[PDB]
């Protein structure tokens, strides 16, 4: 199916306690593969997945340069945004950036992303056409003008459509045995009496990949609405993911309930009964 590549950088100012801390992480789909922490001693983009280790000194140099270069511009962007907003140098501010590209089933370009957030809210973003910018506010509009006069756009568009999808194609091939595997969920149900007239039913989905999954409870084939409790899909810590839905059930009624799990890695969607 479709795939993605993403970079997530975050700078935080530590006023009176040194220079800002820059952290950047890289993902193909739901699989991190690189990192750069400015408070690290390597001072280099480091690998975080096996299939990226096979990249040569040339690659690591290039990527190290671009992230280190970014960290520096960011640290000066935190300064500029203090001026733009007339903010106090006593307060700590955050500057996030996400960048990446979506591709289709055979590796064609679908969408490109380059956008920013100041203190957790939208700052400036590249519209879908990769031709224009959207500015969240008056400050971001100053930088919208600067990137317009600088013609940043036509550079980002060429990179996203080419280099970015070319790179994703490559990673998907080098990380083939992993980035394209589809692990189905290990499913099962539990039972917890809460107070003699009520018992929680809990449906489980474990060790699957990718993270996209649907858990559906039912009472006589009738979807429940939030009498059920979903938990946010969580990372197992080993490349796979987990999730569970629960319902509170009137004692003796347990068997009226069914669980319904849909996942890419399944042939047919499973249904479970206590």
């Amino acid at each position: 199916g479709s795939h993605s590549m993403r970079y997530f950088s975050t700078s935080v100012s530590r006023p009176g306690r040194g220079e800002p801390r820059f952290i950047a992480v890289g993902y193909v789909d739901d699989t991190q593969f690189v990192r750069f922490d400015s408070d690290a001693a390597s001072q280099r983009m480091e690998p975080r997945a096996p299939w990226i280790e096979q990249e040569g000194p040339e690659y690591w140099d290039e990527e190290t340069g671009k992230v280190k270069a970014h960290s520096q511009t960011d640290r000066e962007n935190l300064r500029i945004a203090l001026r733009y907003y007339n903010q106090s140098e006593a307060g700590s501010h955050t500057l996030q950036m996400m960048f990446g590209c979506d591709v289709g089933s055979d590796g064609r370009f679908l969408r490109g992303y380059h956008q920013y957030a100041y203190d957790g809210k939208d700052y400036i973003a590249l519209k879908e056409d990769l031709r224009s910018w959207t500015a969240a506010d008056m400050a971001a509009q100053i930088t919208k003008r600067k990137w317009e006069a600088a013609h940043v756009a036509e550079q980002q568009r060429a990179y996203l459509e080419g280099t970015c999808v070319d790179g994703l194609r490559r990673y998907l091939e080098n990380g083939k045995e992993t980035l394209q595997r589809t692990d189905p969920p290990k499913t099962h149900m539990t039972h917890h009496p809460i107070s003699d007239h009520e018992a929680t039913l809990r449906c489980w989905a474990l060790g699957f990949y990718p993270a996209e999954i649907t858990l559906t409870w039912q009472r006589d084939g009738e979807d429940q609405t939030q009498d059920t409790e979903l938990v946010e899909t969580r990372p197992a810590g080993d490349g796979t993911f987990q999730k569970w839905a629960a319902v509170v059930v009137p004692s003796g009624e347990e068997q009226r309930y069914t669980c319904h799990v849909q996942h890419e890695g399944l042939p047919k969607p499973l249904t479970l009964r206590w």
Binding site: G26, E62, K66, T73, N77, I80, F99, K146, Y159, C164
Partner: peptide, 8 residues
């Protein structure tokens, strides 16, 4: 492949 970045 890490992106290029620009000043605000």
């Amino acid at each position: 492949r890490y992106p290029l970045t620009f000043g605000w």
